[model samples]
Target: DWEIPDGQITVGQRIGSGSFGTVYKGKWHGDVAVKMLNVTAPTPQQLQAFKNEVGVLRKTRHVNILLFMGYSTKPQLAIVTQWCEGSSLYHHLHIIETKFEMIKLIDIARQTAQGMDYLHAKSIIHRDLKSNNIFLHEDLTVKIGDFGLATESILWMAPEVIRMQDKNPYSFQSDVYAFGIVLYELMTGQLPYSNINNRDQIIFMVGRGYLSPDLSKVRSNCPKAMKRLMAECLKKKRDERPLFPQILASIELLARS
Candidate 1:
């Protein structure tokens, strides 16, 4: 991660905030998003995550994935990225729109696959892949961001990953499991098992088998192919889930039909 030049940077109103930092609507050579970390005393793990995100961003260059403009280390630990003010997929589905069409939903799924595939090709597994982290452009184009929690972890994770005990390396299929939950959220405009009431209970059930989000509660008119794709991605067996390439192919076919 390169240091953001002083002359080319400008800060404005805060747009969003997350675990590690607050994102501001700003300019970097041009309009951009300025994400800066705010930890009282940053931990080694926190520092590692910051460097890891910038490291992965340096290797990435894709339209589906958010672009990295620059970063800073000494001043305040900030990252500059392409401006995307449209809204997050979560806000769009749950707040902006009351009805979500299947065609549009499928389109989002296809683009998400493209982004996820791009990362997987580079050997990067986004441990956390959820609607909240997926942003949208004005034209409804999807842009995946926020790698702070992307490192191997257990929250919002796959069962295979859960069983692995954070010992074995992360598998790409784990992201597919996350996509399944995101797809379900898009279809229902609600976080997976939002009504479950307790996080521990959700984790408890998943540990025993309630693996992926349920489509039975989805009120949207979903096609059979999309349903099948979701099921395959949610399979408890990691090897059973379709890889990103196959997943992309299936999405493309669904778009055609």
Candidate 2:
């Protein structure tokens, strides 16, 4: 059901490219964004993994999560989804220089948490969760995209993920840790650990549990409840992190207050 006929699709401008593939503003039955995966000659293992990712997307259905329309494999491997016209959450803050009030920030966080909650409900983990993977609509509502298709950054990684202590390092908690960093990014409008420039050093320090993002630069507009939740999400102990439901409860309380 998630397959799109090759001839029926039309690809347009190259919009964005990342670890997985290039995204294009394209046409299917209507306006859509096509993520043309960068696998020209995928091996059996690679192809199986790609199919697994498609299965994950096929099962996901939520307003805050990116809509998974269908995919094409004949002309070239690609996944098609709704086109987010308002750009990414990362671009909205750091690139375009739009200043936001506290309520607006809360709304974004709440929606993101909602999406994460849905993923966890379905027993799915977003191994790559960050502001960069989140897209915005014209109204500024966020859509968490990319799923587990991208990798190659330690900025939003949890301590356990860096250490790889467990046979499977990634878990729901690791995603929560990344959510904290995104929250920090939303609050301060700065990348985590802005003071540290060396990539290896950051990884080494974070793996050893010595490095955490400095929150001193947090603006006065950030709410105490949100600030406390962000701090809790970054805790080194994986089990100590709050689940998405707990996170939503806290965020919703703040939203109403």
Candidate 3:
């Protein structure tokens, strides 16, 4: 999708900035969000993540997936894409401190599943999936964006990702686990395990060091199967959660009906 257009983009004022990248409110042919990655003196990990972002977004095109307009790999590396006029889910939760109807929350989760389903179909794992990474448009539609780890990436990590003692430690199911947390967060309007500090990440792995979100509200509001699905997604054991395809199918049913 980055091939949608290139070079003519008029980069504008900064809208957002992270450890490795800066997002600007820019004009690309029209209005677009530009994600500029710091690659001037890039690390191997950063360079790889940048490439991965470009590669995945290039192949990605869905209503629920953030659009990739174009990119500049050199001379100030930047990733330009469709602009989300509305705020992220995280902003609404933490900053705006907002709440929503039951159906609306389900809609957000459903749209997220749609995007993840598409990515999984192409055999690509999103690596990162959280409410903070999900953006809303003026029409109230949700679009999933971002890959992984700016700074506080571990907060939403699945047990498998945290437990695996290797460099490459995530899989498609790892994404589903994070999606489960997002669903829980949307339903409750709170980050699951919010009490745990970053310093206790290891403790979170060794044993049950974090407080899990209470799903009583969810059980009361959502359909029984949907409620059960959420629990499955939050399983401490990665193998216990439903796979991405199964996850998508189940969510589609609940969202449609």
Candidate 4:
């Protein structure tokens, strides 16, 4: 029953692309998104990776998390989920001219924190979490998207992850660090360290704590409280960073005030 009947799905125009493949505007019972792998045939490694993503999606159910609809193994390998008509947060914040109030921005951060909180509680580390991985609906409902081991954007990477000394550097705190970057993106409407085009330079600056998103770039209206929270999450020492539980509590307070 978990497997979607290939006939029930009608994939349309390409909406987006991820590490796995292309996401399309699709139809099933309602508006859905079909993420189809670009490869004609799956290697054993590829098939396992695809299944791992599906397994993660299947277990998650939260308002702030992308809803998994179903999947198909035949014709082509694809995963289905509820489509956000407004598109990705990256598009809204960077690609388009849409402007958001401070409250709205913080709310998006809060919602994302909620989704991350759930994911961490279930013992899943989103190895790749960033602005592009977060989606939004027309009504501003934010849903955290993309799961599994995938990373091409190093800007959102934590300092410890950059060091690469540990057997597995990715921890819940690493995700928190990425969220901190997301907070900056929401406030500044620019990529992290956008000034530098070189990846090695970014790794050097951020990893060494020599530079970060310039505070001056943050919107004039963004609250100091929110700014402080972002700093806390981006702390060099993972131990100093607040857990999602604490983060969610603080955000709830921020929203209320």
Each model's TM-score?
Answer: 0.90, 0.95, 0.85, 0.94
RMSD of each: 2.4, 2.0, 3.5, 2.1
Over the full model, what C-alpha lDDT does candidate 4 score relative to the true structure?
Answer: 0.85
As a whole number from 0 to 100, the lDDT of residue 237 in candidate 4 is: 88
**Considering TM-score, where higher is better, how would the candidates rank from best to worst?**
2, 4, 1, 3
How many pairs of residues collide in model 2? 0
- lDDT string, candidate 4, 1-257, tens digits: 67987678998998767867788898989989888887888889889888889888888899988899998987788988898877778888889857888889988999999999999989888878898888888657988888757321798899889988886788999999999999999889888777788889888877787877776788888888888899899888898999999998888898887
Residue 55 error for model 1, in Å?
Answer: 0.6
* Per-residue alpha-carbon lDDT of candidate 2 for residues 99-200, written as tens digits (9 for 90 to 100): 878788889999999999998888888898988888998746889998555221689999999988786788889999999998998899889877788999
Model 1, TM vs. native: 0.90
Candidate 3, residues 51-154, lDDT tens digits: the string is 76777777878999988877776566677778998888889876787777777887788788888888888878877687777999973799888753421166
lDDT of 3: 0.74
Instruction: Provide backbone clash counts, one per model.
Output: 0, 0, 0, 0
Assess each prediction's global lDDT (C-alpha) against the native.
0.79, 0.86, 0.74, 0.85
Best by TM-score: 2
Better of 1 and 2 by lDDT: 2
- Cα lDDT tens digits, model 1, 50-116, are 8888887888899988888888775667888898868788888777764657888888999999999
Clashes of 3: 0
